[PDB]
Write a protein that holds these residues in place. Sequence first.
Motif, PDB file in Angstrom:
ATOM      1  N   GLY A 176       0.866  -1.203   0.000  1.00  9.72           N
ATOM      2  CA  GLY A 176       0.000   0.000   0.000  1.00  9.72           C
ATOM      3  C   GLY A 176       0.899   1.248   0.000  1.00  9.72           C
ATOM      4  N   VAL A 177       1.896   1.225   0.867  1.00  9.79           N
ATOM      5  CA  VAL A 177       2.836   2.403   0.975  1.00  9.79           C
ATOM      6  C   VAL A 177       3.620   2.568  -0.342  1.00  9.79           C
ATOM      7  CG1 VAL A 177       5.091   3.151   2.078  1.00  9.79           C
ATOM      8  CG2 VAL A 177       3.025   2.368   3.526  1.00  9.79           C
ATOM      9  N   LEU A 178       4.108   1.482  -0.935  1.00 13.21           N
ATOM     10  CA  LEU A 178       4.861   1.572  -2.200  1.00 13.21           C
ATOM     11  C   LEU A 178       3.971   2.069  -3.324  1.00 13.21           C
ATOM     12  CD1 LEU A 178       7.004  -1.633  -2.174  1.00 13.21           C
ATOM     13  CD2 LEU A 178       7.736   0.588  -1.658  1.00 13.21           C
ATOM     14  N   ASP A 179       2.688   1.640  -3.443  1.00 15.17           N
ATOM     15  CA  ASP A 179       1.831   2.200  -4.519  1.00 15.17           C
ATOM     16  C   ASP A 179       1.582   3.708  -4.302  1.00 15.17           C
ATOM     17  OD1 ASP A 179       1.529  -0.297  -5.695  1.00 15.17           O
ATOM     18  OD2 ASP A 179      -0.389  -0.738  -4.650  1.00 15.17           O
ATOM     19  N   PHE A 180       1.345   4.078  -3.044  1.00 17.23           N
ATOM     20  CA  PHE A 180       1.149   5.478  -2.624  1.00 17.23           C
ATOM     21  C   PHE A 180       2.415   6.312  -2.949  1.00 17.23           C
ATOM     22  CE2 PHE A 180       1.611   8.507   0.916  1.00 17.23           C
ATOM     23  CZ  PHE A 180       0.345   9.189   0.922  1.00 17.23           C
ATOM     24  N   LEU A 181       3.593   5.833  -2.555  1.00 19.27           N
ATOM     25  CA  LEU A 181       4.802   6.562  -2.824  1.00 19.27           C
ATOM     26  C   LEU A 181       5.041   6.675  -4.315  1.00 19.27           C
ATOM     27  CD1 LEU A 181       7.436   5.545  -0.242  1.00 19.27           C
ATOM     28  CD2 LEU A 181       6.264   7.729  -0.547  1.00 19.27           C
ATOM     29  N   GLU A 182       4.674   5.655  -5.106  1.00 17.68           N
ATOM     30  CA  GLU A 182       4.945   5.754  -6.548  1.00 17.68           C
ATOM     31  C   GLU A 182       4.049   6.827  -7.171  1.00 17.68           C
ATOM     32  OE1 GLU A 182       7.430   4.124  -7.323  1.00 17.68           O
ATOM     33  OE2 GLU A 182       7.544   4.208  -9.605  1.00 17.68           O
ATOM     34  N   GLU A 183       2.787   6.934  -6.691  1.00 22.24           N
ATOM     35  CA  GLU A 183       1.922   8.018  -7.206  1.00 22.24           C
ATOM     36  C   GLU A 183       2.378   9.432  -6.772  1.00 22.24           C
ATOM     37  OE1 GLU A 183      -0.540   7.851  -9.332  1.00 22.24           O
ATOM     38  OE2 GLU A 183      -0.636   5.621  -9.440  1.00 22.24           O
ATOM     39  N   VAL A 184       2.904   9.557  -5.551  1.00 17.57           N
ATOM     40  CA  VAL A 184       3.494  10.811  -5.093  1.00 17.57           C
ATOM     41  C   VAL A 184       4.707  11.159  -5.978  1.00 17.57           C
ATOM     42  CG1 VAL A 184       4.634  11.884  -3.099  1.00 17.57           C
ATOM     43  CG2 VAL A 184       2.489  10.540  -2.741  1.00 17.57           C
ATOM     44  N   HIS A 185       5.546  10.155  -6.272  1.00 21.58           N
ATOM     45  CA  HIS A 185       6.741  10.343  -7.107  1.00 21.58           C
ATOM     46  C   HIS A 185       6.339  10.925  -8.472  1.00 21.58           C
ATOM     47  CE1 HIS A 185      10.022   9.176  -9.896  1.00 21.58           C
ATOM     48  NE2 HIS A 185       9.079   8.553 -10.589  1.00 21.58           N
ATOM     49  N   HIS A 186       5.306  10.342  -9.082  1.00 19.97           N
ATOM     50  CA  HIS A 186       4.937  10.740 -10.478  1.00 19.97           C
ATOM     51  C   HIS A 186       4.289  12.123 -10.407  1.00 19.97           C
ATOM     52  CE1 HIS A 186       6.076   7.209 -12.646  1.00 19.97           C
ATOM     53  NE2 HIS A 186       5.199   6.407 -12.068  1.00 19.97           N
ATOM     54  N   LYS A 187       3.510  12.382  -9.332  1.00 23.12           N
ATOM     55  CA  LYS A 187       2.877  13.648  -9.252  1.00 23.12           C
ATOM     56  C   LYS A 187       3.919  14.770  -9.100  1.00 23.12           C
ATOM     57  CE  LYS A 187      -0.926  14.446  -9.357  1.00 23.12           C
ATOM     58  NZ  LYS A 187      -1.832  14.775 -10.515  1.00 23.12           N
ATOM     59  N   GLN A 188       4.843  14.581  -8.207  1.00 21.12           N
ATOM     60  CA  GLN A 188       5.866  15.583  -7.962  1.00 21.12           C
ATOM     61  C   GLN A 188       6.679  15.803  -9.240  1.00 21.12           C
ATOM     62  OE1 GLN A 188       8.643  18.073  -5.505  1.00 21.12           O
ATOM     63  NE2 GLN A 188       6.441  17.554  -5.489  1.00 21.12           N
ATOM     64  N   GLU A 189       6.981  14.712  -9.933  1.00 19.83           N
ATOM     65  CA  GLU A 189       7.809  14.905 -11.160  1.00 19.83           C
ATOM     66  C   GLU A 189       7.036  15.524 -12.329  1.00 19.83           C
ATOM     67  OE1 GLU A 189      10.569  11.802 -12.348  1.00 19.83           O
ATOM     68  OE2 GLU A 189      11.668  11.972 -10.459  1.00 19.83           O
ATOM     69  N   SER A 190       5.702  15.525 -12.217  1.00 26.28           N
ATOM     70  CA  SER A 190       4.883  16.054 -13.293  1.00 26.28           C
ATOM     71  C   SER A 190       4.762  17.608 -13.257  1.00 26.28           C
ATOM     72  CB  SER A 190       3.442  15.481 -13.250  1.00 26.28           C
ATOM     73  OG  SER A 190       2.709  16.125 -12.209  1.00 26.28           O
ATOM     74  N   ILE A 191       5.252  18.205 -12.198  1.00 23.37           N
ATOM     75  CA  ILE A 191       5.049  19.615 -11.950  1.00 23.37           C
ATOM     76  C   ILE A 191       6.408  20.338 -11.968  1.00 23.37           C
ATOM     77  CG2 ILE A 191       4.104  21.298 -10.369  1.00 23.37           C
ATOM     78  CD1 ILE A 191       2.252  19.086  -9.133  1.00 23.37           C
ATOM     79  N   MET A 192       6.611  21.218 -12.958  1.00 23.31           N
ATOM     80  CA  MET A 192       7.921  21.829 -13.166  1.00 23.31           C
ATOM     81  C   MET A 192       8.386  22.598 -11.914  1.00 23.31           C
ATOM     82  SD  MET A 192       9.052  24.665 -15.969  1.00 23.31           S
ATOM     83  CE  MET A 192       7.375  24.388 -16.545  1.00 23.31           C
ATOM     84  N   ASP A 193       9.555  22.211 -11.426  1.00 25.93           N
ATOM     85  CA  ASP A 193      10.291  22.906 -10.364  1.00 25.93           C
ATOM     86  C   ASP A 193       9.432  23.003  -9.034  1.00 25.93           C
ATOM     87  OD1 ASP A 193      12.508  23.031 -12.057  1.00 25.93           O
ATOM     88  OD2 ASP A 193      11.967  25.007 -12.812  1.00 25.93           O
ATOM     89  N   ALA A 194       8.540  22.043  -8.845  1.00 24.14           N
ATOM     90  CA  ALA A 194       7.808  21.976  -7.535  1.00 24.14           C
ATOM     91  C   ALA A 194       8.776  22.063  -6.374  1.00 24.14           C
ATOM     92  CB  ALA A 194       7.032  20.669  -7.474  1.00 24.14           C
ATOM     93  N   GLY A 195       8.291  22.625  -5.263  1.00 24.98           N
ATOM     94  CA  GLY A 195       9.096  22.729  -4.006  1.00 24.98           C
ATOM     95  C   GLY A 195       9.108  21.407  -3.211  1.00 24.98           C
ATOM     96  N   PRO A 196       9.578  21.456  -1.980  1.00 28.96           N
ATOM     97  CA  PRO A 196       9.701  20.225  -1.160  1.00 28.96           C
ATOM     98  C   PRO A 196       8.347  19.554  -0.979  1.00 28.96           C
ATOM     99  CG  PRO A 196      10.530  22.145   0.040  1.00 28.96           C
ATOM    100  CD  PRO A 196       9.988  22.674  -1.239  1.00 28.96           C
ATOM    101  N   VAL A 197       8.392  18.219  -0.906  1.00 27.09           N
ATOM    102  CA  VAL A 197       7.216  17.451  -0.535  1.00 27.09           C
ATOM    103  C   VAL A 197       6.992  17.582   0.970  1.00 27.09           C
ATOM    104  CG1 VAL A 197       6.153  15.126  -0.573  1.00 27.09           C
ATOM    105  CG2 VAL A 197       7.589  15.909  -2.505  1.00 27.09           C
TER     106      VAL A 197
END
Length: 267
Positions: A176-197
């Motif tokens: 559950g945590v790994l699927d959640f983290l993978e979606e956070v990873h893709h979301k953060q990378e989808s947004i140019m120059d986003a700040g800290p998570v």
Amino acid sequence: GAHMWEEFETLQYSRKEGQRQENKNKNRYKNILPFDHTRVVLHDGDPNEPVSDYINANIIMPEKPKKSYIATQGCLQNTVNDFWRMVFQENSRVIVMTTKEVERGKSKCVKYWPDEYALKEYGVMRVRNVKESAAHDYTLRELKLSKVGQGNTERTVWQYHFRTWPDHGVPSDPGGVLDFLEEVHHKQESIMDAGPVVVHCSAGIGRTGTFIVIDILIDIIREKGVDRDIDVPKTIQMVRSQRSGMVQTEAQYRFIYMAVQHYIETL
């Protein structure tokens, strides 16, 4: 390799700002305080407030896109406004909430988002919840954040609210945590120059630390491959130099190794 070579017991800077009298009621727990050298310093505060630059939060820098984190406590009633000043100022576009609001009858975080299809102003910040998506292990809330009255300051903040962490212990399987983290990873990378998570739980040390350490290790494997050198104690110490006590329990420690091993198995 994700093998555990060392036991949890072998794992074992000033905090002056968090100890100030004006800051005491901004801390959920009296002696869990941010190190001064890494704390998030809040600017542009209300000039009628003698102290307006404090929140119990530290930037965590892993030491490849350069990703960083803010590790923080669940909001208290009196720190919701400061929490949104932090997200705005730091350009954070992804929030990771790892607790319920109330677990076993104790508050872990005051609700700091509006209901779906509503907007609320939290001090100078305007927050609109435009859509929730409720998935097995988490709910994603698409929030739009702007400064009140201020033109073109709006940005989308994606809050990933993990729902399946047990009230006792850690999850028995990390899927559950790994699927959640993978979606956070893709979301953060989808947004140019986003700040800290931003990552939080009740004190901002145990679950927050477990999440951040797993994410850091997985990102190493992204860069270097499954046979890369991994050193979980060294990484935990490196995060602990930036916020006290990250990763609190032996079950959380074991869970880190299990999560990374499972991630490696996926590749």
